[PDB]
Design a protein around this ligand. Structure first.
Ligand code: NA
Length: 249
């Protein structure tokens, strides 16, 4: 089937100057092979029309954002860059082709700037994510006492269409990502032998503890972007982009 429960994650494979992203819902004038690189005051977004230009690193367009990014936890979705404004709980939708801020949204009650980071720290309080069902934001609040909160976002206007309060402490996991409507978290032990240790199914409200091995090289709050179009995990560890294959039940 197209979707299912995560049962296996492959070994990370290093992909041959900054974190880059592709659109899982490519929208004309862009195509599947359009790439965007965030140069890491993170404010420049470099746009490459072709994979050749991207690998033969010559950009086709440079965007200047109206404000800098809090972190690399941004996504490109349906022609827009969605990101968190520095030193804020504000998510911004920046339409890339028109260079227009189409929407801004305060994530209500969200902690930011070192309140609810992942276990390895950094300004990772708030993460944007994309899956088969659309656009998400992962965060926490004082109301939720540091438990991971997730909200499905309307990609047009950034309204919170639905919110779930999960039963896992955000600061106790190294990372999190959403596949087929299920939130998965990555453990934070000491070895490179991490695990996908928890799942929360937003379709049912059912959560459980898992033991899926997840290879991780550095004790660093990596930028993980699941790409539902490729059905692969993409991750940036401040040094390289890597891809994890997956298998769904
Ligand atoms: Na992420």
């Amino acid at each position: 089937t197209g979707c299912g429960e995560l049962v296996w994650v492959g070994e990370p494979l290093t992909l041959r100057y900054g974190v880059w992203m592709r659109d899982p819902k490519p929208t004309y004038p862009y195509t599947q092979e359009t790439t965007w690189r965030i140069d890491t005051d993170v404010r420049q977004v470099f746009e490459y029309d072709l994979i050749s230009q991207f690998m033969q690193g010559y950009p086709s367009k440079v965007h200047i954002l109206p404000r800098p990014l809090e972190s690399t936890g941004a996504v490109v979705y349906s022609g827009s860059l969605y990101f968190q404004g520095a030193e804020s709980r504000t998510v911004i939708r920046y339409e890339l082709n028109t260079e227009t801020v189409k929407a801004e949204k305060e994530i209500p009650g969200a902690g930011y700037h070192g309140q609810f980071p992942y276990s390895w720290g950094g300004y990772t309080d708030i993460d944007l994510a994309v899956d088969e069902a659309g656009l998400w934001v992962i965060y926490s609040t004082d109301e939720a006492k540091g438990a991971i909160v997730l909200s499905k976002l309307n990609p047009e206007n950034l309204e919170l269409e639905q919110t779930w309060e999960t039963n896992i402490r955000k600061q106790s996991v190294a990372n999190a990502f959403i596949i087929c409507g299920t939130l998965y978290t990555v453990s934070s032990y000491t070895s490179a032998d991490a695990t996908v240790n928890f799942a929360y199914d937003t379709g049912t409200g059912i959560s459980k503890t898992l033991t899926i091995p997840f290879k991780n090289r550095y004790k660093y709050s990596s930028m993980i972007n699941y790409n539902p179009l490729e059905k692969k995990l993409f991750a940036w560890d401040n040094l390289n982009m890597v891809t994890y294959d997956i298998k769904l039940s």
